[PDB]
Amino acid sequence: KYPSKAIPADELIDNLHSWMRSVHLLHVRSEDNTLRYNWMLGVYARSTNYTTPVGQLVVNAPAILNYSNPQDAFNS
Amino acid sequence: MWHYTSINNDTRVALDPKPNQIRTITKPNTVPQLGTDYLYTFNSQRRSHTLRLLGPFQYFNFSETDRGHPLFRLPLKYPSKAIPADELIDNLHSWMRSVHLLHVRSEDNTLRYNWMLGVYARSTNYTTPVGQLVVNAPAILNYSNPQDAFNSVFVALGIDYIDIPITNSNIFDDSSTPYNVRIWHAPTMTEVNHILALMRKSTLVSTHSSWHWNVLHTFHYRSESDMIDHFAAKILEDWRQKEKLDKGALVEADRVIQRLIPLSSSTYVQRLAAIGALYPNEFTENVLDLSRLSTALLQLSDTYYQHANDQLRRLYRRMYNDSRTLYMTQRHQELLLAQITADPNILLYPYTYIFTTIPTSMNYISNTGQGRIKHSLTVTGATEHDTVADIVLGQTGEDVITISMVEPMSIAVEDMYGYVLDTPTRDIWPADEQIEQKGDAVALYDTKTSRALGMFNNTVRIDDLLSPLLSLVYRTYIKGDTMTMTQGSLDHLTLCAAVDSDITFVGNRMIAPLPEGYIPKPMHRNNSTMKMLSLYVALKKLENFATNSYLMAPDTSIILLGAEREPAVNILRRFNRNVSNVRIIGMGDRAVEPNIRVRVPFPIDKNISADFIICDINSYEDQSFESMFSETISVVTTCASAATRALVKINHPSEYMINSVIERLSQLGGVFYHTALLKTASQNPYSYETYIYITPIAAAVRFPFYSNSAMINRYMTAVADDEMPIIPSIHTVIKGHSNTYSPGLFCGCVDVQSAPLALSQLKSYCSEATTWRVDSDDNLVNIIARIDPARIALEFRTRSNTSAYHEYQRYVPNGLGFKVRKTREFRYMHREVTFIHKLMMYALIREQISLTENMTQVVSIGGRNLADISVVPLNMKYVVIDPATRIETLTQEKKNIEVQSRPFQFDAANMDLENNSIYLFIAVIMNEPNGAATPARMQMDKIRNVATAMLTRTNCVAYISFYEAGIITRLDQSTAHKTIRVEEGRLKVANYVPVDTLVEADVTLMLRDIGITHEIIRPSTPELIDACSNYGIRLGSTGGAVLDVFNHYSPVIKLVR
Amino acid sequence: MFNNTVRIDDLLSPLLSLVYRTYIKGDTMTMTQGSLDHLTLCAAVDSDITFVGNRMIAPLPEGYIPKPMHRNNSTMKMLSLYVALKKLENFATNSYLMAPDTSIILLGAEREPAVNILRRFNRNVSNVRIIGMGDRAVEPNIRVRVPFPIDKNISADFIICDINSYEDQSFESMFSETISVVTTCASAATRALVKINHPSEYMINSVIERLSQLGGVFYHTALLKTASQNPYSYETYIYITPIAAAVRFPFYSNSAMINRYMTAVADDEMPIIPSIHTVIKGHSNTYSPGLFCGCVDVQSAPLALSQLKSYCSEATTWRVDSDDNLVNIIARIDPARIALEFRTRSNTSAYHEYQRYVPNGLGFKVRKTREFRYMHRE
Amino acid sequence: PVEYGIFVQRGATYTINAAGEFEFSGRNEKWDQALYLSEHFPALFSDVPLAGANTIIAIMRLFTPQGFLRTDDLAIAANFPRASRNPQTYIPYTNQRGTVTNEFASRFRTIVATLANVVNERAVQDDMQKATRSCTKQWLRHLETQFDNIAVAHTDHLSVVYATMSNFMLNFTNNFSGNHATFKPDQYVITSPEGSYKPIIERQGETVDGLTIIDTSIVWPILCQCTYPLVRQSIMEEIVYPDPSTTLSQSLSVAQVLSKLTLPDAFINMILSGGDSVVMRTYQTEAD
Amino acid sequence: TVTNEFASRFRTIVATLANVVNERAVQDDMQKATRSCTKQWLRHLETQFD
C-alpha cells in the first residue's frame, strides 16, 4: 500500500492491534508455579490451524503445552 | 457510635415530576447539556460507546420507533472513535423533541406524575391495557399518595399485576434485558404476605426488603445467570452502604437493606444470599476481587460453608437453609423500626431474622491496583519455626521479570564532567625506594592485575552507564522540547555529544529550532568519547577554576594525541563552532581524517604544538615492561614538550612509573613542571587508568614525587586473586535457615497461599524483597530479593528461626502487589559512594578480625542500626553503644547482641575496656552523639584517651576511623563531588554536618608519644571488589572518580595491645 | 456523625477538580515555583508539570488530556502538614520546595498519593528523598512496621507520621504504641509531625515526659491542626523539634486541641437528624431542626410565608414557570426565630404585604435548585 | 473477514458458568445440533460486545425477539399439566390495537435500514453497478411495505391464536424465555437407580414424519404470498372462533390413554420397588 | 478445520490480483461494468477453489 514511504504510525498501530486481537493460542491455565507454556508448539499448531498431528494433539489436549522440566515438554 | 444514623426516603418517588413539569421535561427549547441532561463516554480500549440520560429519563423505555432514530445509529457509525459532541447533541436533541408523554396538568400541589407507567405506555405505543388506560385517561397518571397511583390502574384494569420491562442504563445497547419487574396489587400487608408466599412456589423470582411507591414488586429472571449477576450487584450495594452506616456517617439510603431476597432460586443464588447477609469482614479488607464479583462471592461462601469459625459456619448454614428469610443486624432493624414509625402503613418484607454479628480479629492488608510491594523483612518475629520445608520458586517468563546485568546510572549532566585531583606529597625520591618500587611495578606488570577487577571493569562500561542519559538529550532535542542554555555551558557540550548535526543559537541562551522534516542522527560515540570530553573540561577548569564557559579561547589550540575516529574531536570542533580561529585535531598512529595519522614521539621534521593536549595513547600489543616504560616515558616527554597543559594517560600508574615521569620532567632543561594526578567521572568506574596533569610553573615544585597516593593505590593494591570472580547467581530454592547461598538474588514465584511462608524464610538472607501478582486472576506471586551479607551476618548468629509469618499472612491475597507491566531487576544495583566506602571498610576490618585469635567480643561503639554487624564473626558476641540504636530485647536475646543504648564516654578513667575485645570506632569520633560536629582538637583528644585507656589491657584492638586533612586540599581543586563537599574547610559527606579533619602526621606522632602499637590501614582494591561482589553493587561513575581520593583519606587507626 | 458526614475530601473536591478542569483547557498560565497554587496544581493532575520559564507552566502537548490525580481523604491533609513543616523551619518562606540534599518521610502509608504529588512538586529540585513507610505500604513506599527493625537505618530532615491502628485494642497497648511511635518519630528526625489519635492531656504529657527521658536532647514541642483535616476531627498533630535550651513550660493543661477531644463524651441522646418539614402549622413550636420545603398554589403562598415566619428567619421562593401556578418554597428553621416568636401567644405577621407578591412577585427559576442540609457559616 | 477473525478467535461457542459469566471456547468449530442439549451455546447469539467485531454484534442484534412472555393463566386455572413451576410462553408479537404505526413492522423497518447499510458497503467494495445496487434497495423497501401490510394480521390476530394455544392442556413445556443468549430447555429424564436413564428431550433421530426439519424459507410465502382475514380489511371475512371441544376432547383422549397406559408396569414395579438388594457380610464382634 | 489454508491462500492471492487488475482497469479508463465483471469472475474462482 505504501511502496515509497513510511507506513503512517496510526495505520501501523491499528492494523497491528486488530491483528493482535485476531490471535488466540490454546492453553490450559493452571495453579502450579513450576509450569511454563510451550510457545513454539502452540504458535506452530495455530499457524497450521491445527492440521498437523501436533496441531491435533494440541487442539485436543492443550494441557500438553504446559511443562515443568523443559525437555519433557517435547518428550510428551 | 453504635446506633445508625440515616434518612431513608423513596428516592424513586422523588424522581417523578409534578404533572405541570411533564410538558417541558424534555426541555424542547434548549439543547441537552453534558453532565446535566446526558453523560456520554467512549471507552477506547473497549471501543464501546455509552450514553446515559440524567434526570427522570434515567428510567426510560424506548419504543421501537424511538430505536429507529439516527441517534441510536450513531455507535455503528463510529466503530473506533468517540462520537463528535456536535452530532451527539444534535441527535439527542432531535430525539428529545421526538418524545411527548401523556399528561393532564392540574393545580393540586400534592400531585405527582407516574413517570414509569407513562413512559412505558409510550414505549408500547399505548397498545398494552395500561397504554389504553393511559391514552384514554391520562389523569390516572397523576397521584397524591404514591401507592394509589398503581392501585388505580389495578382496579381499573382488573389485573392482579403488571409486568414492566426494565431499562438498560446505557441507552445505546439494545441487548435483551436480564429480567423484569412485575408490580402487584397488594395494598395491605396481608395481601403482600400472600403474594410472597405464592411467589415462593415459582421459579426464578426475588424481591427487595422494601419497595418503592410502597407497592410490592418482584423481579423475574430469564435465567439463573441473570439472577446471579443481579444479586451480586445488589450485595455490593448493600455492603458499601452498611460499610458507610457502620462508620456512623449520616446516609441518604433509599432503603435500609439494599440486597435482594430470593423467593425461589437455585443453590448458587442462595449462597449469594447467605454471604450477602453475613456482611463478611473480607469485603471491608478488599480481600475479594470485584473484577468478577459474583465468582469471588461464591468462593467466599465456600469458605464460610466450611469456615474454621464455628459461629460463622453455623450462621452461614442457617442463612442458607432459610433463604426466604431476610437476615439483618439489630442496628438495621432499629432503622426499619424508625421507618415503620414515620410511615405506619409502610410495607416491608415480613419474614426476617435478627442476628448478632460475629466479630473477627484478622485485619488483612490489601490493595487492588498497580504497585509492587517493597517489603522490609524483619530479622525476627513472634512466630517460631522448626525444620521448615524447602520452598521452590517457579521459573518466571521474561514477560514478567527481566534481569539486566548492570543498573544504568541516572544522573545530572554536569556530574558527568567532574574530576578529582591528587597532588604529590614527597620532597625526595631515594634510590632504595626506587629499587623497591621498581621491583613492585615489574612484579605487578608481569603478572596481570586482578581478574575480578577486570571482570567489573569490562562489565560496568561507562558508555552503557551514560547511554540512557545521552540518548535522552537527543530525544528531547529531536522533539524540539529543549530550548534554553548558555553558550559555554556543560549542558551545551552534552548536546553536542548527543547529536551529529551542528547546533546554533538564535540569540543568547536559545538554540535554533529544527528545520522542518529534519531529524539528524545521534552522534556516534565510542567508550572513550565522554571521557575525552571530560578531560577537555578538566583542562578548562585547570587553566582557571572559576570559569563557567567552556569554549576554547580564540587563537588557541588543542590536541587529542591518541586518536582513531575520535568522535570527541568532532564534537569539540562543533561545540566551538562560534569561536574564531581554533585548531582542534586528533593525532593517533591509527588516526583517520580529520585527525592526522602519526606516531609518537613525533617525526623530527614535523612541527607539533598546542596550548593543550589530551593524550590517550595505549598500546594494544603485549610487550616487555622495559618497552612499555620507555614508550610511556617518551609519550609523557613529547606531551609535555609540545604543550603548556598536557593531560597524559598512564595505563599502569605504579609509584615507579609516575615518579620516573616526575624525574624525567626534572631532567628537561630550564623548566619546572608542576604536576597532579587526575581522574574524571566519565572514566569507567573500575579503571585504574589515571591521567597525569603536566604544567610548567616558574617556581620549583616542593614535594613533587608521589608516595602512597590514592590513584596509585587503586592500581598497586590490586593483584592477581587466589580465587575465581564471584558470579552473581539467581536463586530459586528458599531453604529454611540454611546459610549456603552465594551472593546473587532470589527470584521467582509461588502460589499466593505459600507467599507468607516464603517471605518468612527469605528474611534470613535478603534484608528486603519486592513482590507482586501479575493480575487479579493469576494466583502466582512473583518475588525478587537481593541477598544481603549483613542480614546473613545478623540472622545466622544463632540457630533460632523466628519471623513475622503471622503478619505476612495478613497480606494474602490482595496485600502483596499488582503489576501488569514487566519489571526489570539488575544484578548490580546502584549505591552512593559513601555506602561503598562503608562496605569496603567493613571488608577490611572483617578480614582483619577473622585473623585474630581468642577474642571474646566485638564492641562496636556508635554502631547505629547494627551497621557493623557484617564485621563480627557469628560465634563471638556483639555489643553496641550508640544512643540512637533502638532496643529489641527479644531480637537481642535471640541473636546474641547486647546494646548499651547510652552515649559512650571518652574520658579515660571512666572508660572500661575489657580484655580480649575488638573496639570499633567507625566514623564515631568525628561526631557528638547529638550529631553536632566535634572540633578536631577534641577528636585527637578522644583518640588519645582511647589510646591511653587501653594501655593497661592485655589483649584489645581498637579501630578508630577518621578523616585526614589532605583531602580538603584535594577537594578544593576537584569538581567531581556530588556527595562529598568542603564547606569552610570542613568535610561534609552525605547529609552529615560539616566536620573538621585530623592531620595524619600529628596523629601518628601522638600515638608514638603514647607508645601503643598502631597501624594506619585503609581498605584497598580487593576490599572494593569483595564489597561489590558480595552486595551485588556496581560502583557508578561519580563514585569511580571520587572513591580513590575519598578512601585514602579515611584512615583506620588500628590500636593493638 | 458529623465527622463522618462532613468529610474534607468532598469539601475540597469542587475546588481541586476546578484546577484540573482549567489546566486541561490550558486556561491556567502563571504561578511561582514554590507557590501553594503550584502544589494545588500537583495535587490536581497525575501528569508531571514543568515550567517553560519563570512563572509559566508548559502548554499541554496536542491530544493529551492527563487523568486527575487520585486522592484519598488524608491526601490534602498530608500536603498541608508538609506545608506546616515548611512554615516551621522558617516562617517567612514563600517557596515550599524542599532544599536540595534533604529528605522527608510520610511514616503512615498505603498508596499515599501525597508522596507522589510531593515527589512531582519537587521534580526540579536536585537530590531529594521522599518516601512513605507504612505497615500496609505499597511501592514507591517501603512496607515496614514502626518501631523500625533494629537493623534498618531510617533518618530524615522531616517526618509526617499518620499512624492509626484500625484494630480495636486495650488502652495500655494503644498508649505504648503511640508512645513508641512518637519516640521513633522524634529520634529519626529534627522535625517530626506525629499524629495523636487520642489527644488526652495524659497522652500528650506522657509524650513530653518520654521526650524528657531521652538522653542529652531537649525537645521543644507544639500541638497543631491543619485546615485540610476533617473539620470535626479531634485528631491532633504534635510537632517535635530539638532545641539547645531546656523548654520552660513544656507540659499541657487545659489546651484547646485537647479540650476539643476531652470535653466530647458519650451523649445521653441520639444525634439530631435534620428533617424536611412539609406541614406548616400555625404558631405550633413542635418542629425539630431541619427545613420546610415544598410548594403551594400561589394564592396560598402569602399565607404560607405568613406562617413560617414563626420558625424560619428567611425563606427563598420561586415559581418554576409562568404557566405553572405552584410556588416552591425552601426555608431553614432558625432556633433564634423560635426563641423570639414563641415568647408570647400573639401571631402577627406581614400577610398584608406578602399578598402583594401574588402572582409574579415571588420568584421565577427554570433551573433546578440545590439546597443543603448543612449550610456554611463563618 | 477482519471482524470475523476477531470474533472467532474468541470461540464459536460459549458456556454459562455456575457464577454466571460466559466462557467462550476459543475454538472455531462447526455447530452440531447434538450440541443443543449440551452446555454450549452458539456465540453469535451471546450478545456480548467484542472490540473490533462491533458490526457482527450489531447485525446479530437484528435476530432479537419482538415478543413478550405471557404466563399460561387459563391453563393454571384449569389445572392443566405443566412441567414448569411457573408456566409461560413466549408470544412472538404484541397486539397493536388502535395505533397508526405498528411496532412489529417498525422494527423490521430499522432492521432493513441496517441491512441496507450493510449491503451498500458490500456493494461499493465489490464495485458493482449502481443499477443493481438501487434494485437491491428497492426490493428491500418493497419487503418493508409487504411487512407492514401483513404485520397487522400477525400482531393483532396470530398473536391471539398463540395466546390460546399456550393454554392448551398438552402444551406442557415452557417454549422459550425470549433470551437467545441464555435459554436452554429444562432437561428432564426418567432416571432409575438400577438402569440407564431416558432423557425426554433427545436427538434420537426419529423425525416424526419430517416434523423436525425446519424450512426457514417458509417465511417467504408468509410475507409475500398469503392472505389473512385482517389483511383483507374492503371485503370482510369475519374472524373464526373455533369450538374448544374439538381440541379439548382430543387432549383428554390422549391424556386418558397415556394415563392408564403405564399402569401394569407401574403396579409391578411398585411391588418390586423394595426388592433390589446388596450383598453384605456380617462379622461377629463377640462370642455367642 | 472449518477453514482450509490452501484455499485461504488462494483467497489472498485473488485479492492481490484484484488490486492489480483494478489499477490496470482504471489506468485504461475501461467501463465500470466490465471491471466489476472481472472482480465477479475472480470471486467465483475463489468459491470453486474452496
Ligand SMILES: Nc1nc2c(ncn2[C@@H]2O[C@H](COP(=O)(O)OP(=O)(O)OP(=O)(O)O)[C@@H](O)[C@H]2O)c(=O)[nH]1
Ligand atoms: N517457529 C518457531 N521457531 C523457533 C521458536 N523458538 C526458536 N525457534 C527456532 O529454532 C531455532 C533454534 O533455536 P536457537 O537455539 O535459539 O537458535 P539460534 O539460531 O541461535 O536463534 P537466534 O536467537 O535467532 O540467534 C532458531 O533458528 C529459531 O528460529 C519458536 O518459538 N517458534
Ligand SMILES: Nc1nc2c(ncn2[C@@H]2O[C@H](COP(=O)(O)OP(=O)(O)OP(=O)(O)O)[C@@H](O)[C@H]2O)c(=O)[nH]1
Ligand atoms: N421502566 C421503568 N423501570 C423502572 C422505573 N423506575 C424504577 N424502575 C425499575 O424498577 C426496579 C425496582 O426499582 P428499585 O426499587 O429502585 O430497584 P433498584 O435495583 O434498587 O434500582 P437502582 O436505583 O437502579 O439501583 C429497578 O430495577 C428499576 O430498573 C421507571 O420509571 N421505568
Ligand SMILES: Nc1ncnc2c1ncn2[C@@H]1O[C@H](COP(=O)(O)OP(=O)(O)OP(=O)(O)O)[C@@H](O)[C@H]1O
Ligand atoms: N457454598 C456452599 N454453601 C452452602 N452449601 C453448599 C456450598 N457448597 C456446597 N454446598 C452443599 O453441597 C452440595 C454441592 O456439592 P459440591 O460442593 O461438591 O459441588 P458444588 O455445588 O459445585 O459446590 P462447590 O463449588 O463448593 O464444589 C450442595 O447440595 C450444597 O447443599
Ligand SMILES: C[S@@+](CC[C@H](N)C(=O)[O-])C[C@H]1O[C@@H](n2cnc3c(N)ncnc32)[C@H](O)[C@@H]1O
Ligand atoms: C585506547 S585508543 C584511544 C584513542 C581515542 N581516544 C579513540 O578511541 O578515538 C589509543 C590509540 O592510540 C594508538 N597508539 C598506541 N600507541 C601509540 C603511539 N606510540 N603513538 C601514536 N599512537 C599510538 C593506538 O593505535 C590506539 O588505537
Ligand SMILES: C[S@@+](CC[C@H](N)C(=O)[O-])C[C@H]1O[C@@H](n2cnc3c(N)ncnc32)[C@H](O)[C@@H]1O
Ligand atoms: C556515622 S554513624 C555510624 C557510622 C558507621 N556506619 C558505624 O556503624 O560505626 C555514628 C553514630 O555513632 C553515634 N555516636 C556519636 N558519638 C557517640 C559517642 N560519643 N558515644 C556513643 N555513640 C556515639 C551517633 O549516634 C551516630 O549515629
Ligand SMILES: C[S@@+](CC[C@H](N)C(=O)[O-])C[C@H]1O[C@@H](n2cnc3c(N)ncnc32)[C@H](O)[C@@H]1O
Ligand atoms: C490512617 S492510615 C493513613 C496512611 C496514609 N496517610 C494514607 O492513607 O495513604 C494509617 C496507616 O498506617 C498503618 N499503621 C498502623 N499502625 C502502624 C504501625 N504501628 N507501624 C507502621 N504502620 C502502621 C495502618 O495500616 C494504616 O493503614
Ligand SMILES: [Mg+2]
Ligand atoms: Mg435502586
